[PDB]
Structure 1
Amino acid sequence: STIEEQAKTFLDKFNHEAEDLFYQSSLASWNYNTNITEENVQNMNNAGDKWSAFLKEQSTLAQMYPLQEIQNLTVKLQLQALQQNGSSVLSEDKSKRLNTILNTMSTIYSTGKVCNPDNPQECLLLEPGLNEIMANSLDYNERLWAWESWRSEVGKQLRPLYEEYVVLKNEMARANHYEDYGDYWRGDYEVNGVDGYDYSRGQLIEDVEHTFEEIKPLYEHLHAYVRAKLMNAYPSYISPIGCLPAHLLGDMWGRFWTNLYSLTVPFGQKPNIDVTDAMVDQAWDAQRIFKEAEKFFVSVGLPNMTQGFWENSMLTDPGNVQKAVCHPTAWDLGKGDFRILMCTKVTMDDFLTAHHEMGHIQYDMAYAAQPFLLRNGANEGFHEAVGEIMSLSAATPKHLKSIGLLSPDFQEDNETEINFLLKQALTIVGTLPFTYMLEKWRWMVFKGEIPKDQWMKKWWEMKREIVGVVEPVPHDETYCDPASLFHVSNDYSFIRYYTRTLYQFQFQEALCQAAKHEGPLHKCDISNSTEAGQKLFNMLRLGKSEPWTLALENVVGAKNMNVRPLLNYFEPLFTWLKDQNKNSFVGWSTDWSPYAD
């Protein structure tokens, strides 16, 4: 009864019950996901309902213990995570209104239908075909149509709903001593009073705007190259001092330039590394690939699979007609019962996805000792970060020719290396300007700086200034372009895909500087080492029990995200791009327009 002994003794009970219930819920869910029937939806909805009701009751009960009389750090962190009101601080009818606006937004996004002006009877959804038209077509007219349509029919309906959504979320967040909603998102990177490891909610914006400054020397050259290359497929449509038209990037919103590899390959007659026929000519099943992944993981010094994962998991899609959503996922039903749900085919891409998923499996195996409320990554970003380095280290030619899938006399050269590096940088450094731009735009519109009659003009001037792309058609203020992105119209945070891109290469360099590697970083492997495994595992097992700025400094040695490893990873590509642009004009002028000529 030491004013705190009450917190501990509460916490225990909670712990137990929580864990148990959660498990019930989760088994239920895995079920429905692996065997789609009509009754299983009911078997899982009530389990989720009971879990949610229990958690909200415990949250309403935890309030009775003040948060300044606690002295131990871990119990304070657990209470601070549980004591969160979340929603339901609003007026009751406004809560239902918020649920309605959210669900209506999600539905209007999901079931969008756009139809041709030449044939309005049968037409296209978003997922089947629209992405294919925007990715694989090659005529300017069809791309411009597919681009303007989706923003003229799904951008116009969403604005009068997003307007109310903003103010409702702001009034929600403003009851928990917060000043807007964006702060309620940045609050994930917050650390209070640990004598030096503190990280104020504000300094996240400072880091982001301070690390985006060092990327531009590389992004500018990449933009110049991609532009001078796109000036071949569509002759006399781009200006050599202008920006790019949004409907030429490779998808609906311009998030990944990966589909531009067909037009901008450096050496179009030297094929890259690809183990796809060598696999099937060796009769590899879904079992063999996972055995290879586990062998690689155990080679570095991590434990085996739990021997309950080989009988329960579903590695190959069920033969008969058994509807199960084929989207890879790593389940941690808790209680040490880990599973992997994915419809593996015999392709090297699935061979890399297996590694990327067993990464999450290992990361979940590590921290299974912490209290139940601390079973996550250090923040939202570390999870996929620690996941992706396995795929980045398993795709190098060394690890391939050491497993029996490449001819021993396969000799790699600098041409194939530049090819691979551009294929990588079309995805890694390509999405960063878009990500930072969209997140800054959302923070701005939430804090109230941008008046609600200047949304689209500000968004497009930002697309002109930062990322270097220009709209093809004018858009007045009956539109809303950002509401046409999945992570926006569904109330999903969108800054993790910018911190992950940095944490990735920081982890890569920090780790395989212990494997005593000597060459460029893009050939670096973490196999056969034991110091690397220990350095990684001394962070994998913390969970949330320590501030993330300590989880970093125990791996790389710094107390923040630094972009230098990224540039050090791309240095060869940068040396090449500095030569292939001796005659073009780097950068872009925000005056050019595709219609004002």
Structure 2
Amino acid sequence: STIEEQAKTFLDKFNHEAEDLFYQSSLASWNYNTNITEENVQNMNNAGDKWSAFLKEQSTLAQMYPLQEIQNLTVKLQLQALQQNGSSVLSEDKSKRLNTILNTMSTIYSTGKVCNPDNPQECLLLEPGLNEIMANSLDYNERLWAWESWRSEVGKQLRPLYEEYVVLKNEMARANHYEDYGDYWRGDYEVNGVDGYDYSRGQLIEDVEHTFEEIKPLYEHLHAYVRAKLMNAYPSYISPIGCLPAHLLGDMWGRFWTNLYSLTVPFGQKPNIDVTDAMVDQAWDAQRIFKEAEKFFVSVGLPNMTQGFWENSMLTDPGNVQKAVCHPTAWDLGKGDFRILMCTKVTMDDFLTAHHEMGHIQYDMAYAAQPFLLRNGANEGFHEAVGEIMSLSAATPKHLKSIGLLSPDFQEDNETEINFLLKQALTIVGTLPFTYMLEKWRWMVFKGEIPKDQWMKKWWEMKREIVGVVEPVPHDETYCDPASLFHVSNDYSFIRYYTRTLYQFQFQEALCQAAKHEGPLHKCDISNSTEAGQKLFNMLRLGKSEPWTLALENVVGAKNMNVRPLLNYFEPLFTWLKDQNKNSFVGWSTDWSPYAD
């Protein structure tokens, strides 16, 4: 009689009908990625539209069950996502024009290219063409030509398409009773209905801004060290208290500094840990690479992989006849069908990536018993965070020596680990400032605090203050830097990468306390320890059915994000960088520019 019974009935029949259409929609995309054919391209659109229109048809009946009469927390969470109308709230024109802007901006990204200034005939596309050249390019002009010319025909041309994306997406948030479109993404962390665990959407701006203050002393030292090694190349453009060029970050957007690890090696007289030459002599293939990782999850207590998982895996690309995307991805369809599509070579990264790609599948097995709408991570940062903790355990010399990759007589000391922390710091400490910088800029533009003319004026003004990077060539409001980015042009969450760093480290410190490991954190290894797996398995099966604030307390015992695990794991590196920076100036100034003298 009560609306509760009617709501639970609508939710029971929704999981069955949605599981069949969702599985066929994801299955169609699998055959399209594994094999490029005219039949798979159409099946992805038909199966994709059938499932896309399914939620639109169920959303009409979901708004007829108010959440005020529902006293069940698990029931409101399932209807919380269905209550949203998506693009239905937008006008007929604004709703159809939105997909045209997303498809137009996404097409220019893949079709965009920059012709070689020296070779006008040869014109290389950004990916891989422009992303690979900028990685190993040490030239100042060669890197500036592709970096400066890209945003000229892209950033400038995408400005009118980006303006519509800002006005169109805002109309959707306002129809949803949201302060703005920026608050739309913050809704993933929204927590309500539980006394004391409530997490407001606006509290994210204060947490990300409060936690970033503690990372400054660690990043300032890491930035001063990188500027000292590269200061001998161009002392005029690189000031001691200034900032590093934007195109010298090692790649197009300067997201990860790992490419600079070669020249930033503190000690070149000592060997480095690499499994490439060790795996070659062992004569291992893609079939035994995943098998070795499957035994790791069993040592911690996690169930093994189903027979269909290993049988349906795609270990390589059979030439151009049948082509697939080598980009590692973990595909979860449904009905217990788990698969991974990746191109498997013999490298030290593929071994670490195998644990990451398998972490997503292993993570999907815990909450697989939850309802369709309840199957998901507690937030957007837990997806890749659970997979990083698995890779961090494999990179430790203790895990490598266990399976026999690294020689048992390999000497492990400060000089050996100091070089390892620097490699992980560039990929970790390097993305944090860039993530908080770009993510915070989008929130200000969407909120309306930055006029359209100040988009670029505030972009570089906040860049030197956050990441300490200055533009070699000044740009006007015509250019759009985020327009060229992959996540910004594809309408994907860019904040999930910032929180992933804080979440992956919290679990690393908590899981190692259960296994009773002593010494530095980077020396910890969760293998052979079945006590840490039982504690992490509890939250793995919860998913988003419970507030992420509550599930996070059962693991690390914290009700919010904390930077403490970031300082301890990087503590040994901070102590060494502090001494090497005594002869230099720690930090940078925002009053220095390469074109302003």
Which TM-score band applies after superposition, normalised by the shorter structure? over 0.9
TM-aligned CA deviation for residue 118 of structure 1: 4.2
Any conservation in 2 of the 1:87–1:172 contact (CA below 8 Å)? yes
| CA distance in structure 2 between the aligned counterparts of 1:166 and 1:43, rounded to whole angstroms | 32
| CA distance in structure 2 between the aligned counterparts of 1:40 and 1:483, rounded to whole angstroms | 30
Any conservation in 1 of the 2:539–2:551 contact (CA below 8 Å)? yes
TM-aligned CA deviation for residue 320 of structure 1: 8.2
TM-aligned CA deviation for residue 92 of structure 1: 0.5
TM-aligned CA deviation for residue 109 of structure 1: 2.1
TM-aligned CA deviation for residue 235 of structure 1: 4.2
**Counterparts in 2 of 1:97 and 1:45: CA distance versus 1, 3 Å:** closer
Any conservation in 2 of the 1:115–1:123 contact (CA below 8 Å)? yes
TM-aligned CA deviation for residue 193 of structure 1: 2.4
**Counterparts in 2 of 1:146 and 1:364: CA distance versus 1, 3 Å:** same
Give per-residue Cα distances to partners, 1:30-79, cap 9 Å, x unaligned: 12222221112223321222112222101111111112111111111101
Query: What's the % identity of the aligned pairs?
Result: 100
Aligned to 2:304: 304
Give per-residue Cα distances to partners, 1:74-97, cap 9 Å, x unaligned: 111101111111112122022122
User: How many residue pairs are counted as aligned between the two chains?
Assistant: 597
Within-5 A mapping of 1:65-76: 65-76=65-76
Between 478-487 and 215-224, report the one with greater CA deviation: 478-487
TM-aligned CA deviation for residue 236 of structure 1: 3.4
Any conservation in 1 of the 2:190–2:200 contact (CA below 8 Å)? yes
Give per-residue Cα distances to partners, 1:82-138, cap 9 Å, x unaligned: 111111212202212222222222222221122244443332211133223322122
Aligned to 1:545: 545
Give per-residue Cα distances to partners, 1:452-473, cap 9 Å, x unaligned: 1211111111012111010001
Any conservation in 2 of the 1:301–1:530 contact (CA below 8 Å)? yes
3-state secondary structure, aligned to 2:325? coil
| CA distance in structure 2 between the aligned counterparts of 1:312 and 1:162, rounded to whole angstroms | 40
Any conservation in 1 of the 2:356–2:387 contact (CA below 8 Å)? yes
Any conservation in 2 of the 1:106–1:490 contact (CA below 8 Å)? yes
| CA distance in structure 2 between the aligned counterparts of 1:238 and 1:438, rounded to whole angstroms | 23
Give per-residue Cα distances to partners, 1:392-411, cap 9 Å, x unaligned: 00111111111112222122
TM-aligned CA deviation for residue 451 of structure 1: 1.2
3-state secondary structure, aligned to 1:379? coil
Any conservation in 1 of the 2:36–2:323 contact (CA below 8 Å)? yes
Aligned to 1:568: 568
**Counterparts in 2 of 1:24 and 1:410: CA distance versus 1, 3 Å:** same
Aligned to 1:238: 238
**Counterparts in 2 of 1:593 and 1:507: CA distance versus 1, 3 Å:** same
Aligned to 2:290: 290
| CA distance in structure 2 between the aligned counterparts of 1:474 and 1:333, rounded to whole angstroms | 47
Any conservation in 1 of the 2:317–2:323 contact (CA below 8 Å)? no
Between 99-108 and 536-545, report the one with greater CA deviation: 99-108
| CA distance in structure 2 between the aligned counterparts of 1:397 and 1:170, rounded to whole angstroms | 49
TM-aligned CA deviation for residue 174 of structure 1: 0.8
| CA distance in structure 1 between the aligned counterparts of 2:91 and 2:320, rounded to whole angstroms | 50
Q: Is 1:273 paired with 2:273?
A: yes
Give per-residue Cα distances to partners, 1:392-437, cap 9 Å, x unaligned: 0011111111111222212212111111111110110111111101
Between 513-522 and 27-36, report the one with greater CA deviation: 27-36
| CA distance in structure 1 between the aligned counterparts of 2:16 and 2:147, rounded to whole angstroms | 52
Between 141-150 and 197-206, report the one with greater CA deviation: 141-150
Between 494-503 and 140-149, report the one with greater CA deviation: 140-149
TM-aligned CA deviation for residue 303 of structure 1: 0.9
| CA distance in structure 2 between the aligned counterparts of 1:467 and 1:455, rounded to whole angstroms | 17
Any conservation in 2 of the 1:151–1:484 contact (CA below 8 Å)? yes
Aligned to 1:416: 416
Any conservation in 1 of the 2:454–2:477 contact (CA below 8 Å)? yes
TM-aligned CA deviation for residue 271 of structure 1: 2.2
Aligned to 1:315: 315
3-state secondary structure, aligned to 2:193? coil
Q: CA RMSD in A?
A: 1.4
Between 358-367 and 322-331, report the one with greater CA deviation: 322-331
TM-score, normalization by structure 2: 0.97
**Counterparts in 2 of 1:136 and 1:176: CA distance versus 1, 3 Å:** same
Give per-residue Cα distances to partners, 1:131-155, cap 9 Å, x unaligned: 2332212221222222211122211
3-state secondary structure, aligned to 2:340? strand
| CA distance in structure 1 between the aligned counterparts of 2:116 and 2:318, rounded to whole angstroms | 38
Between 214-223 and 144-153, report the one with greater CA deviation: 144-153
3-state secondary structure, aligned to 1:205? helix
**Counterparts in 2 of 1:148 and 1:319: CA distance versus 1, 3 Å:** closer
**Counterparts in 2 of 1:553 and 1:38: CA distance versus 1, 3 Å:** same
Any conservation in 2 of the 1:363–1:540 contact (CA below 8 Å)? yes
Any conservation in 1 of the 2:452–2:477 contact (CA below 8 Å)? no
Give per-residue Cα distances to partners, 1:319-352, cap 9 Å, x unaligned: 7832122222222221111122222122222111
Any conservation in 1 of the 2:328–2:341 contact (CA below 8 Å)? yes
TM-aligned CA deviation for residue 482 of structure 1: 2.2
Any conservation in 2 of the 1:133–1:146 contact (CA below 8 Å)? no
3-state secondary structure, aligned to 1:330? strand
3-state secondary structure, aligned to 2:61? helix
Any conservation in 2 of the 1:382–1:503 contact (CA below 8 Å)? yes
Aligned to 1:200: 200
TM-score, normalization by structure 1: 0.97
3-state secondary structure, aligned to 2:242? coil
Give per-residue Cα distances to partners, 1:488-520, cap 9 Å, x unaligned: 122121100000011011000000111111100
Between 440-449 and 583-592, report the one with greater CA deviation: 583-592
Any conservation in 2 of the 1:140–1:234 contact (CA below 8 Å)? no
Aligned to 1:369: 369
Between 112-121 and 350-359, report the one with greater CA deviation: 112-121
| CA distance in structure 1 between the aligned counterparts of 2:316 and 2:109, rounded to whole angstroms | 31
**Counterparts in 2 of 1:516 and 1:142: CA distance versus 1, 3 Å:** same
TM-aligned CA deviation for residue 2 of structure 1: 1.7
**Counterparts in 2 of 1:181 and 1:357: CA distance versus 1, 3 Å:** same
Give per-residue Cα distances to partners, 1:265-301, cap 9 Å, x unaligned: 1011212111112212122122211111011110111
Any conservation in 1 of the 2:73–2:193 contact (CA below 8 Å)? no
3-state secondary structure, aligned to 1:120? coil
Give per-residue Cα distances to partners, 1:358-382, cap 9 Å, x unaligned: 1111111111111110111111111
Any conservation in 2 of the 1:225–1:577 contact (CA below 8 Å)? yes
| CA distance in structure 1 between the aligned counterparts of 2:116 and 2:407, rounded to whole angstroms | 50
Give per-residue Cα distances to partners, 1:527-560, cap 9 Å, x unaligned: 1112101001011110111100011100010100
Between 420-429 and 301-310, report the one with greater CA deviation: 301-310
Gaps of 5+ in 1: none
| CA distance in structure 1 between the aligned counterparts of 2:548 and 2:128, rounded to whole angstroms | 40
* Structure 1 stretches of 4+ moved >6 Å: none
**Counterparts in 2 of 1:279 and 1:133: CA distance versus 1, 3 Å:** closer
